[PDB]
Curated annotation (Swiss-Prot), chain A:
The gene is ELOB. Belongs to the Elongin B family. This is Elongin-B. SIII, also known as elongin, is a general transcription elongation factor that increases the RNA polymerase II transcription elongation past template-encoded arresting sites. Subunit A is transcriptionally active and its transcription activity is strongly enhanced by binding to the dimeric complex of the SIII regulatory subunits B and C (elongin BC complex). InterPro entries: ELOB, Ubiquitin-like_dom, Ubiquitin-like_domsf. Heterotrimer of an A (ELOA, ELOA2 or ELOA3P), ELOB and ELOC subunit. The elongin BC complex interacts with EPOP; leading to recruit the elongin BC complex to Polycomb group (PcG) target genes, thereby restricting excessive activity of the PRC2/EED-EZH2 complex. (Microbial infection) Following infection by HIV-1 virus, component of a cullin-5-RING E3 ubiquitin-protein ligase complex (ECS complex) hijacked by the HIV-1 Vif protein.
Swiss-Prot record, chain B:
At its N-terminus, contains L-isoaspartate and S-adenosylmethionine (AdoMet) binding motifs. Also contains an extended SOCS box motif, where the Cul-box is separated from the BC-box by ~90 residues, within its C-terminus. Component of the probable ECS(PCMTD1) E3 ubiquitin-protein ligase complex, at least composed of CUL5, ELOB, ELOC, RBX2 and PCMTD1. Interacts (via the BC-box) with ELOB and ELOC; the interaction is direct and stabilizes PCMTD1. This is Protein-L-isoaspartate O-methyltransferase domain-containing protein 1. The gene is PCMTD1. InterPro entries: PCMT (IPR000682), SAM-dependent_MTases_sf (IPR029063). Signal peptide: none annotated. It holds the Pfam family PCMT. It is a lipid-anchor. The lineage of its organism: Eukaryota, Metazoa, Chordata, Craniata, Vertebrata. Residues 76-85, 151-155, 172-182 are annotated as: AdoMet binding motif. Keywords: Cytoplasm, Lipoprotein, Membrane, Myristate. GO terms for cellular component: Cul5-RING ubiquitin ligase complex; cytoplasm; membrane. The active site is at S55. The keyword Electron transport does not apply. PANTHER family: PROTEIN-L-ISOASPARTATE O-METHYLTRANSFERASE, PROTEIN-L-ISOASPARTATE O-METHYLTRANSFERASE DOMAIN-CONTAINING PROTEIN 1.
Swiss-Prot record, chain C:
One of its GO terms (cellular component) is cytosol. Heterotrimer of an A (ELOA, ELOA2 or ELOA3P), ELOB and ELOC subunit. The elongin BC complex interacts with EPOP; leading to recruit the elongin BC complex to Polycomb group (PcG) target genes, thereby restricting excessive activity of the PRC2/EED-EZH2 complex. (Microbial infection) Interacts with HIV-1 Vif; forming an active cullin-5-RING E3 ubiquitin-protein ligase complex (ECS complex). This is Elongin-C. The chain holds residues 17 to 111 of 112 of the full protein. It is found in: Nucleus. The lineage of its organism: Eukaryota, Metazoa, Chordata, Craniata, Vertebrata. Belongs to the SKP1 family. Overexpressed in prostate cancer cell line PC-3 and breast cancer cell line SK-BR-3. It comes from Homo sapiens. Keywords: Host-virus interaction, Nucleus, Transcription, Transcription regulation, Ubl conjugation, Ubl conjugation pathway.
Swiss-Prot record, chain E:
The gene is CUL5. Component of multiple cullin-5-RING E3 ubiquitin-protein ligase complexes (ECS complexes, also named CRL5 complexes) formed of CUL5, Elongin BC (ELOB and ELOC), RNF7/RBX2 and a variable SOCS box domain-containing protein as substrate-specific recognition component. CUL5-containing ECS complexes specifically contain RNF7/RBX2, and not RBX1, as catalytic subunit. Component of the ECS(ASB2) complex with the substrate recognition component ASB2. Component of the ECS(ASB6) complex with the substrate recognition component ASB6. (Microbial infection) Interacts (via the substrate recognition component) with HIV-1 Vif; forming an active cullin-5-RING E3 ubiquitin-protein ligase complex (ECS complex). It comes from Homo sapiens. Belongs to the cullin family. Changing K667R: Abolished neddylation and interaction with ARIH2. The modification Phosphoserine is found at S19. Gene3D superfamilies: Cullin Repeats (1.20.1310.10), Cullin, Chain C, Domain 2 (3.30.230.130), Winged helix-like DNA-binding domain superfamily/Winged helix DNA-binding domain (1.10.10.10). One of its GO terms (biological process) is G1/S transition of mitotic cell cycle. Changing E660A: Impaired interaction with ARIH2. GO terms for molecular function: calcium channel activity; protein-macromolecule adaptor activity; signaling receptor activity; ubiquitin ligase complex scaffold activity; ubiquitin protein ligase binding; ubiquitin-protein transferase activity. This is Cullin-5.
């Protein structure tokens, strides 16, 4: 089974996938292809770590378990991510909370 | 009555455990037995009539004991019959089980669907469990499609012929359990490796030997094939989580669900279906 | 070959068509006069919807085992109501 | 070079099957004369069969349907001719 | 819960193919679900409002459709409008889903379209198009599409899946059939009484082909269709059957004149009419039967002796009518059966015995065979076997055939040996039993045995010198075929030889009992006169007379004295002396007599005879000094008398063979009623002889009377066979 992964940037997110044996640069190229976005002062960061310009395999912290279909492994893409809208829902009486 | 015989079986340690205890009480004997009599399911006797060969009494007690039925595993019933035991196992396994059965006579299958609809629409225990509804196919016990995936728990609903023994061993997933009255002798089998198996006896039982296929020049042999495994859709999943939440609250408070499910801020068709499963 | 899904928060998700086209309504859209602005679907619900789709597309070939799919009670009602609108 | 004698003598004659030419088993006349089978055992018109035996067709001309035999011997007649 | 503010605008934008923004197309998905959930009576009202909207659009559509007065414009309008409507039919069931292909709104659309725009205008729609077809039959090449479109529309309106053949069948095909029938029925009179049967047939066939072409072009041939069969049937009813009674009028004229080409149209057109074929078969049969009988019946009796003309006329009739049937009717089995029945009705009227006579004229030393080679003779015999293959009385041939074969092979008067041998294969081709077929081989083997016996006698006895001795020893049936065993005195050269021959064949060949027939014997003897020497080749009786005259040519011997000398009866001596004194077409007479006679009967006992001193061979009207004269001729053959006796035999066979048929039935039918026996005889008798029942009844009675057939004691109408 491949690995479900989700990347962020501002108000646009990507679902994507790869192998454990892949490098970071492959992810950079998938992103640059899907978004047609050349690296004008933008790279790939893990939970906000530069990863320099990529082309590495030793620092893959996206092990398979953390990149599941039920749950993504998150990539941290001047950075600013707009989060979602937090659930405007309450216990609603029927759920004594 | 059902509780009388359930207590007797616990007395003879034919039930013993709590999970099997709950399953047995949930389902009333005679419900699944023919319309004319509705008396003798409560007795250890022969329940062979017409094409029906069920064994709710201590026979099925022993079988349920031999099979562990922890939640989340997969159970395959060869010779399902009227679906009595498929129903009981469904009570235990939980939503994310895989519950399939195979049978030779189509009229009995229509009967089994009638009985399931009866149970869902009239029983009291349904909304006390995360039931697993069994699915059925028609075919012979020896002609399962050749590419099946595998199954963790395998049961033979009738006498098993020695010269097909291994034909079933190949079906069992690495580590599973198989229960069968081979030569009318009840036994457990465990796949301890890729090409190794081990076995133990249980009890000397009485069963009718199965009927072997005789079709030729056709795609019957090892072709039947169990229902496809599919990943269900979101309404069923969400329904289950909501029912979990409410039952948990009610357990805390005990230290009726229908009333709670009706005050939820939902469209009326959603009230009926998404929770009530239409009563 | 990528159909974007945009919620009513101005929010965006990327999903390819073979993954996306596993519901009747999404076929119906684009089967008649990509992008898909779901007016009555907030952002946070849509994220979980996409994950369910990709999970099913992956587990269609399931062998015998079944994993569990966590849904939190804070958004469960709204997933129930936004679920039948797509299938 | 035959000139004067009967060089083209058509000596017409016929032979009838028998064991010997000294006695007659179906007649009481000379062997070289007509058969007496049609008179003593009741003219003698002799006809041949495929079995190489003589017979008389005095009545068989219309009775051969049920009398297909050779009275002059002990064998049945095999039809060869039906005309004159 | 009032979303009927944007939905009416967007629906009426969808229907008329007005531009739709994507945003609206998305929003309509959400709003309908919104209403169906938060309510209790959305499901019952969304589609009622929808029905109102569609119906308003459709009313506008009828206004526009009828706004045109021209037929082509009206058709094109209905076509385009239905076209856009159907294109959008699939475009607005997507929303409105699950309110009850199988969609609700599609069913609403098609039912409303028909109940509000079709039924009303329809009265016009299917009319104008049909008129165009009529114009096409008048030479107006109108655009076929103008009709084709209407077709494709009807089949679609049938939303019913379990029965779609409702609109197209009900409201289109009937119009085409009615218009075709009207056109052809009212156009037929232009030729029904304006030209003949041949031209009318040509016109009808051409119109049938043209309307078939139109049928495939315009009528729907989807599957069950059956469209072509009804249009073709109505066309045939209008064009062919309406004139069939007059078409059959010229059938006899065509058949009589052997106009096979004209019969092509006649047969081809009347093969389509179920009851138009029998008249032509009957005409052919009766024409053939009458044409044959009117001459053959008279010829069968007036011919008498001229078999050649009878056989040739039969062959000419057979060939002519066979050619007529082969050409006119394309060798159709029904007309071949008619030809066979007609031939049987002619050749069976009573016995073609003359056919056998013809074979004799083709197998004997006669002028017919002398001018023909063996291959030509075989080709002619092919005609005889062809004739024999038809007549029911087949066995009448064999009587005369075997009589002639016996007289040819026994008298050594055969034209050729190989042509005689070919009769074996001829009879095998005819289908006769081998018992008769192998008679030729048996006779030839007997002749070889005769030659061997003669050589054996010659090698031992050497009266007549052995070199000139030719003794015939053949089977008994070869020569002893008559009771007139007349014996005559013989010359010294033969009287001193016969005893030795008899002794040799009695002792050296035990069993073979030799028997002499002086009537059929002959020989050559040298004689001399006062004008020259000669040789006479004459029968044994003439030989005895001229031997008695040899030692006293110049003397006078009375009739009784000659009788005593030759020991001959009255008739034989009379015929011999008539052949010696008044030989037909003979320049010189062997013997002279005093009295004047008109025939042999006028000879008296006291009539004196003498040897003609001037008799000799005559060549170029000159007397020769030496030469051979043959004066046997018919003396050693037979006379019209044979035709009588043979005829009697034929009659006998007409009984015997028939009786044999009966027996052959009873040997295969151990117990059967009289009717079953008669029915079996119908097929059995065709091989040997098939007389009328007037004689079969008496023959069966004779068979039972002679204790040959058994009758049920309690049932006189059941015959039983035993053993």
């Amino acid at each position: 089974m491949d690995v479900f992964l989700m990347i962020r940037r501002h108000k646009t997110t990507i679902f994507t996938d790869a192998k454990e044996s892949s490098t970071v640069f492959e992810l950079k190229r998938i992103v640059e292809g899907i978004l047609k976005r050349p690296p004008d002062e933008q790279r790939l960061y893990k939970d906000d770590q530069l990863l320099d310009d990529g082309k590495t395999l030793g620092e893959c912290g996206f092990t398979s378990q953390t990149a599941r279909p039920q749950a993504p492994a998150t990539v941290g893409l001047a950075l600013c991510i707009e989060p979602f809208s937090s659930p405007p829902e309450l216990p609603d009486v029927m759920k004594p909370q | 009555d059902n509780d009388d015989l359930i207590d007797n079986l616990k007395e003879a340690q034919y039930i013993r455990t709590e999970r099997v205890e709950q399953a047995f009480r949930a389902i009333d004997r005679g419900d699944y037995y023919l319309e004319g009599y509705r008396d003798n399911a409560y007795k250890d006797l022969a329940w062979k009539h017409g094409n029906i060969h069920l064994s709710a009494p201590c026979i099925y007690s022993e079988v349920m004991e031999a099979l562990k039925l922890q939640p989340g595993l997969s159970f395959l019933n060869l010779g399902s019959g009227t679906g009595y035991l498929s129903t009981m196992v469904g009570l235990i396994l939980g939503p994310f089980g895989i519950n399939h059965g195979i049978e030779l006579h189509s009229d009995v299958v229509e009967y089994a669907k009638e009985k399931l609809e009866s149970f869902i629409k009239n029983s009291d225990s349904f909304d006390k469990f995360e039931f697993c509804e069994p699915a059925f196919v028609v075919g012979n016990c020896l002609q399962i499609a050749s590419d099946s995936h595998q199954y963790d728990r395998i049961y033979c609903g009738a006498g098993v012929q020695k010269d097909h023994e291994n034909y079933m061993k190949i079906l069992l997933k690495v580590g599973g359990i198989l229960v069968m009255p081979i030569e009318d002798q009840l036994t457990q089998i465990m796949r301890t490796g890729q090409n190794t198996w081990e076995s133990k006896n249980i009890l000397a039982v009485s069963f009718a030997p199965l009927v072997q296929p005789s079709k030729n020049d056709n795609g019957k042999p090892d072709s039947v094939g169990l229902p496809p495994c599919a990943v269900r859709n979101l309404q069923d999943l969400a329904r289950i989580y909501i029912r979990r939440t409410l039952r948990n609250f009610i357990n805390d408070e005990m230290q009726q669900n229908l009333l709670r499910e009706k005050i939820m801020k939902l469209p009326l068709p959603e009230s009926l279906k998404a929770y009530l499963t239409y009563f | 070959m990528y159909v974007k899904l945009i919620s009513s928060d101005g929010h965006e998700f990327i999903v390819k068509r073979e993954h996306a086209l596993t519901s009747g309504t999404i076929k119906a859209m684009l089967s008649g006069p990509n992008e898909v602005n779901f007016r009555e679907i907030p952002s946070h619900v849509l994220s979980k919807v996409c994950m369910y789709f990709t999970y099913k597309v992956r587990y269609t070939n399931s062998s015998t085992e079944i994993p569990e799919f966590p849904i939190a009670p804070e958004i469960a009602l709204e997933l129930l109501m936004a679920a039948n609108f797509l299938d | 070079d035959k000139m004067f004698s009967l060089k083209k003598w058509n000596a017409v004659a016929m032979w009838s099957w028998d064991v010997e030419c000294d006695t007659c088993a179906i007649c009481r006349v000379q062997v070289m004369d007509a058969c007496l089978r049609c008179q003593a055992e009741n003219d003698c018109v002799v006809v041949w069969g495929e079995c190489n035996h003589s017979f008389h067709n005095c009545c068989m001309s219309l009775w051969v349907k049920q009398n297909n035999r050779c009275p002059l011997c002990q064998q049945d007649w095999v039809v060869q001719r039906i005309g004159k | 819960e009032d979303k009927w503010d944007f939905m009416r605008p967007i629906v009426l934008k969808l229907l008329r193919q007005e531009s739709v923004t994507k945003q609206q197309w998305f929003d309509l998905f959400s709003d309908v679900h919104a209403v169906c959930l938060w309510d209790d009576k959305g499901p019952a009202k969304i589609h009622q409002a929808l029905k109102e909207d569609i119906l308003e659009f459709i009313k506008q559509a009828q206004a526009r459709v009828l706004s045109h007065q021209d037929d082509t414009a009206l058709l094109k309008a209905y076509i385009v409008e239905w076209r856009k409507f159907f294109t959008q039919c699939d475009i607005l069931p997507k929303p409105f889903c699950q309110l009850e292909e199988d969609s609700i709104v599609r069913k609403l659309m098609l039912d409303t379209w028909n109940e509000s725009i079709f039924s009303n205008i329809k009265n016009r729609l299917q009319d104008s198009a049909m008129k165009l077809v009529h114009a096409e039959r008048l030479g107006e090449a109108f655009d076929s599409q103008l009709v084709i479109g209407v077709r494709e529309s009807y089949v679609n309106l049938c939303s019913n899946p379990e029965d779609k053949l409702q609109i197209y069948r009900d409201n289109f095909e009937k119009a085409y059939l009615d218009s075709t029938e009207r056109f052809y029925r009212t156009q037929a009179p232009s030729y029904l009484q304006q030209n003949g049967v041949q031209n009318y047939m040509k016109y009808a066939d051409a119109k049938l082909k043209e309307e078939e072409k139109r049928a495939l072009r315009y009528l729907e041939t989807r599957r069950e269709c059956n469209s072509v069969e009804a249009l073709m049937e109505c066309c045939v009813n209008a064009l062919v059957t309406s004139f069939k009674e007059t078409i059959l009028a010229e059938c006899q004229g065509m058949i009589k004149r052997n106009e096979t080409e004209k019969l092509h149209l006649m047969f081809s057109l009347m093969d389509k009419v179920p009851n138009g074929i029998e008249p032509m078969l009957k005409d052919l049969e009766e024409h053939i039967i009458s044409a044959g009988l009117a001459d053959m019946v008279a010829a069968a009796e007036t011919i008498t002796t001229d078999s050649e003309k009878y056989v040739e006329q039969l062959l000419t009739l057979f060939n002519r009518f066979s050619k007529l049937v082969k050409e006119a009717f394309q060798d159709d089995p029904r007309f071949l059966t008619a030809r066979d029945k007609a031939y049987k009705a002619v050749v069976n009227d009573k016995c073609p015995e003359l056919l056998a006579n013809y074979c004799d004229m083709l197998l004997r030393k006669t002028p017919l065979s002398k001018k023909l080679t063996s291959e030509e003779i075989e080709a002619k015999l092919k005609e005889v076997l062809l004739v024999l293959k038809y007549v029911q009385n087949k066995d009448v041939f064999m009587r005369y055939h075997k009589a002639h074969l016996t007289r040819r092979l026994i008298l050594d008067i055969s034209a050729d040996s190989e042509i005689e041998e070919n009769m074996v294969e001829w009879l095998r081709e005819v289908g006769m039993p081998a018992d008769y077929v192998n008679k030729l081989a048996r006779m030839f083997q007997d002749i070889k045995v005769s030659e061997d016996l003669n050589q054996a006698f010659k090698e031992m006895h050497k009266a007549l010198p052995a070199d000139s001795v030719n003794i015939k020893i053949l089977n008994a049936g070869a020569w002893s075929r008559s009771s007139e065993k007349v014996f005559v005195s013989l010359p010294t050269e033969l009287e001193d030889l016969i005893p030795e021959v008899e002794e040799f064949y009695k002792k050296n060949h035990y069993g073979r009992k030799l028997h002499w027939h002086h009537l059929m014997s002959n020989g050559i003897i040298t004689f001399k006169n006062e004008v020259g020497q000669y040789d006479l080749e004459v029968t044994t009786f003439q030989l005895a007379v001229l031997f008695a005259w040899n030692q006293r040519p110049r003397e006078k011997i009375s009739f009784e004295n000659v009788k005593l000398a030759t020991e001959l009866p009255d008739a034989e001596l009379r015929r011999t002396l008539w052949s010696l004194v008044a030989f037909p077409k003979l320049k010189r007479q062997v013997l002279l007599y005093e009295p004047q006679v008109n025939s042999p009967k006028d000879f008296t006992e006291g009539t004196l005879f003498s040897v003609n001193q001037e008799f000799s061979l005559i060549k170029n009207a000159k007397v020769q000094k030496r030469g051979k004269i043959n004066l046997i001729g018919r003396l050693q053959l037979t006379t019209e008398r044979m035709r009588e006796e043979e005829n009697e035999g034929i009659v006998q066979l007409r009984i015997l063979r028939t009786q044999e048929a009966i027996i052959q039935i009873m040997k295969m039918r151990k117990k059967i009623s009289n009717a079953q026996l008669q029915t079996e005889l119908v097929e059995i008798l065709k091989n040997m002889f098939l007389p009328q029942k007037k004689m079969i009844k008496e023959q069966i009675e004779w068979l039972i009377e002679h204790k040959y057939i058994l009758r049920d004691e309690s049932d006189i109408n059941t015959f039983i066979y035993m053993a």
